[PDB]
Amino acid sequence: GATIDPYSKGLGMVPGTSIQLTDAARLEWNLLNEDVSLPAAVLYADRVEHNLKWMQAFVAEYGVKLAPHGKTTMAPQLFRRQLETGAWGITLATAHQVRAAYHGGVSRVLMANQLVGRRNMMMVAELLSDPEFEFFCLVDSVEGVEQLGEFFKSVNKQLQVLLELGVPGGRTGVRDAAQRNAVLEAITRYPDTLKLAGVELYEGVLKEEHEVREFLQSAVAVTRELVEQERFARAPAVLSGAGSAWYDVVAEEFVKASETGKVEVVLRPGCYLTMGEGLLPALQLWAYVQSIPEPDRAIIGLGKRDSAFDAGMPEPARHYRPGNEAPRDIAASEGWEIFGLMDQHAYLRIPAGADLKVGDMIAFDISHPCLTFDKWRQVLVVDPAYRVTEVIETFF
Amino acid sequence: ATIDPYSKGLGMVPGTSIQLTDAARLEWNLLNEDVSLPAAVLYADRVEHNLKWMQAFVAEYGVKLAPHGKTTMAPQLFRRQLETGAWGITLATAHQVRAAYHGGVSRVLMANQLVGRRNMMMVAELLSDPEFEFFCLVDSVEGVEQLGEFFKSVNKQLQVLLELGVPGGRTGVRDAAQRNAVLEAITRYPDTLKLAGVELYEGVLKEEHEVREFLQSAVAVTRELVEQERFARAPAVLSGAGSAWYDVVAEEFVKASETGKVEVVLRPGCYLTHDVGIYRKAQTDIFEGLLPALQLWAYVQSIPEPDRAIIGLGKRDSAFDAGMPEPARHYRPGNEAPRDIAASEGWEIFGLMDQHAYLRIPAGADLKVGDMIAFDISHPCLTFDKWRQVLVVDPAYRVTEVIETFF
Ligand code: NA
Missing domain, CATH: 3.20.20.10 (Alanine racemase)
Structure with a gap:
């Protein structure tokens, strides 16, 4: 009853089957500490x-x-x-x-x-x-x-x-x-x-x-x-x-x-x-760099199972290396661009010599966020320190 | 593993601890309209x-x-x-x-x-x-x-x-x-x-x-x-x-x-x-095979123009990668059984929106608001992530089990 689903994707460890969604904070998940399985859907509170x-x-x-x-x-x-x-x-x-x-x-x-x-x-x-x-x-x-x-x-x-x-x-x-x-x-x-x-x-x-x-x-x-x-x-x-x-x-x-x-x-x-000019983008999908097989091609752990194609190609917005204090914003000028979305993987174009490693995380913006929601049974809500404060359940 | 009382494509789920494998006890029959459409239906x-x-x-x-x-x-x-x-x-x-x-x-x-x-x-x-x-x-x-x-x-x-x-x-x-x-x-x-x-x-x-x-x-x-x-x-x-x-x-x-x-x-x-x-490529070596096991069932919601019916099936129910749904069976409530729909009926889906689909029909089609249509899809496995619960039916359209998914 409004409890976290212990078998869903995009979550940290869920130690019981009746943990209220609104009690998620007591699990002490922090996105940057790698407490949460990626890919994950992340709303900024x-x-x-x-x-x-x-x-x-x-x-x-x-x-x-x-x-x-x-x-x-x-x-x-x-x-x-x-x-x-x-x-x-x-x-x-x-x-x-x-x-x-x-x-x-x-x-x-x-x-x-x-x-x-x-x-x-x-x-x-x-x-x-x-x-x-x-x-x-x-x-x-x-x-x-x-x-x-x-x-x-x-x-x-x-x-x-x-x-x-x-x-x-x-x-x-x-x-x-x-x-x-x-x-x-x-x-x-x-x-x-x-x-x-x-x-x-x-x-x-x-x-x-x-x-x-x-x-x-x-x-x-x-x-x-x-x-x-x-x-x-x-x-x-x-x-x-x-x-x-x-x-x-x-x-x-x-x-x-x-x-x-x-x-x-x-x-x-x-x-x-x-009604709409001052609205801010509230949702990003976070995924791991899984492989960088060629100097200009990275494979990301994000696919069509995670991101509606009708939402538009995910756009790299933040980059984070485990152990760092904070993510950094990715500038358009860097030319990081998803050029392919498969079932469970995405192809990322990067300039050769970009500072990117297997195990790094990337936060992606998507153009039509709400259309992605049906790929997520559980969406995370995070505070500005990337601590999960609530889990949001969906009824698709 | 128990039936989700809040999921789509199900009948009346009278408790929160009904085992998926005990679905047959609920006595849902697809033709009796016991189940909410749209539904994903596997044939046992x-x-x-x-x-x-x-x-x-x-x-x-x-x-x-x-x-x-x-x-x-x-x-x-x-x-x-x-x-x-x-x-x-x-x-x-x-x-x-x-x-x-x-x-x-x-x-x-x-x-x-x-x-x-x-x-x-x-x-x-x-x-x-x-x-x-x-x-x-x-x-x-x-x-x-x-x-x-x-x-x-x-x-x-x-x-x-x-x-x-x-x-x-x-x-x-x-x-x-x-x-x-x-x-x-x-x-x-x-x-x-x-x-x-x-x-x-x-x-x-x-x-x-x-x-x-x-x-x-x-x-x-x-x-x-x-x-x-x-x-x-x-x-x-x-x-x-x-x-x-x-x-x-x-x-x-x-x-x-x-x-x-x-x-x-x-x-x-x-x-x-x-x-x-593996099956397509095995045919040379082999010389009754694999059959399509899944259909999506939906209602006719409206027939607003003689050549256009609106169907309660959308992109929320049917993945784009699975292929455009193709009408395969038609059932009018009260009847004994569905009928097969052949290509010569002239029924074709021409649009799939979020929660609705557009069906082209010939003027004077044998079709009414509240009828059900069963649709084939080319790549049935690829539509599973639209369903948390998938029905399994016997040949009399009785639900024998519910299949849960982990997406
Ligand atoms: Na729950």
Whole structure:
């Protein structure tokens, strides 16, 4: 129960099976003392807290609240920090994810996805006898609504749904007004079970601004009509877009729905580990130099098992020789560059005669940090002296 | 070893101490929608068919195999491999060795350099088990000295294999100077490091005359060390991959395989498909074989346009290196059984996002929200690190066991 996994990678010696993650400090792991198996995933406590407090300081120019997507870390320890620093809820994608977040103390989850399949539905139904828990999922088809309605009725629960709008050539969401009206009608056939709680879209399938505005404006018109018809079962109704790349455009268009006093706008941002200019990169992967077979080629103990290829090639940022007081920063001018990532190894180009030895450590930055998280069941949190203060568990 | 109550791809797990091997008692049936989709599904009868085939193959040709476990990291599967004749399991990292040890593997060839005090300590802890045999690779004086000093300081002994490499390659000594420097360094730790043999990965090379030359060098270095009596293990181990280049390796290692001073150990990959080198290359010699044993099951979530269905399967569930998922079976809840999907149905996955996939279908397809599709993937072993728990089913789609992974 929120205990360190003694068989995971990227850890030091774990002398019991019930050592609380938050008690990791008593194990006295220090990264520089080689207490920890490399490769390891390392969050800097000072930077994580910086990024949290930075986001907390953010005063929006518009009436909008944030439900950051949790799928990139799947770490309820981080979700709780996000919620205590002002997030409205967590956006998740699967029933499995929702259960994980719920048992990690998240009390509001926007499942930005269709809920389908008997076990996925039951996994959500299991959380719905908690009167303090708030849940939403998306609907975009009559069949999907009927499946939800029949199931949740059969287990005597209520389920909040958001009508999802979509676009031609897009992903999910109703494509036109006739579909929209059929989906809305289907919901009224389960009056004691399904509860229309708002409207949702993902505007980022579109590329041009005029298309985005026109899509946002159709969502506003549908929302205002449902307000006027008193067809929402939640007060306020929720209107949600991604609002990342299109943050400004989404806010401008969605204000028109808010002006009813009956709708709250909820946006669904991504990674906090890099609203955004002052965020600091909080995660590095640390690996050993295992072999330097040629004067310009080093082999590193880091592979695709440790670092998502969709995160981008790892970039050497720090160098540390065991026995030294501290690491040193690697300057771009040194030309240390990963030119190959295999399963468990990386190829590092170095200038001939570089001061690098087998057994040295390198800390790597990665461009899209959160995408790497799913390669790590345990992520370390370190203080500025590289002492591990906490272990973060993930639920992938 | 118990079922993780918080994992994906499972049914209702009603306790925290349900043994993985007692999964059948939970009575999960895939077609009854007892299990959360997406799920990774191994077919028991196919896994067993593949193991039995490799067992029969090893008896025909006398080959010693240490199959790669790095791609599945599933000691339940490792144990079956060893029970049906594997010589040991080949692994990549100290963490993996420890997991395999914990899962009852009694011989590991770590086909990698062992570097770093915690990594070394993790291996040292296991060496207190006198029934466990371990090997790792050395390719540098610095690496040999770091191992020697560490294992001497914990009063243990370590078997190492000299790794031969090639210019522009991966690891391994490049030339005779480098080779002799590594061997000499080994001899500086006479009661700690035990030279147990010679290893290479020949498929860094692409042309055949190069591979043969490299293999020939391996045989020559081994023979030389046999004559000088530099090995501290009888027999000494000579190990090549012998998968993608199985037929060439088999020929070149002829004389080492024939002697009793040396045992040849090959390192095949995936036993969950016909697409493994040792099997593809054995066909000439052989003239029902290896079958694909894994499929990923997912729901249809939305059919928003007549030619486009959205599937609850993403890059979180299906590794890019495994290949694009291909629809293979279709099941509508309430029905007796799935149906086979042929290419002529016109279903094809055209996009895989984080948690969703795009399925092209012909307008008017026999498909509905809430149906399940089973997908084939080209390299099934390579998708295991997306799953902490993998289901095993019997022919009636009843879950008979859950397989845990150590990634
Ligand atoms: Na635990």
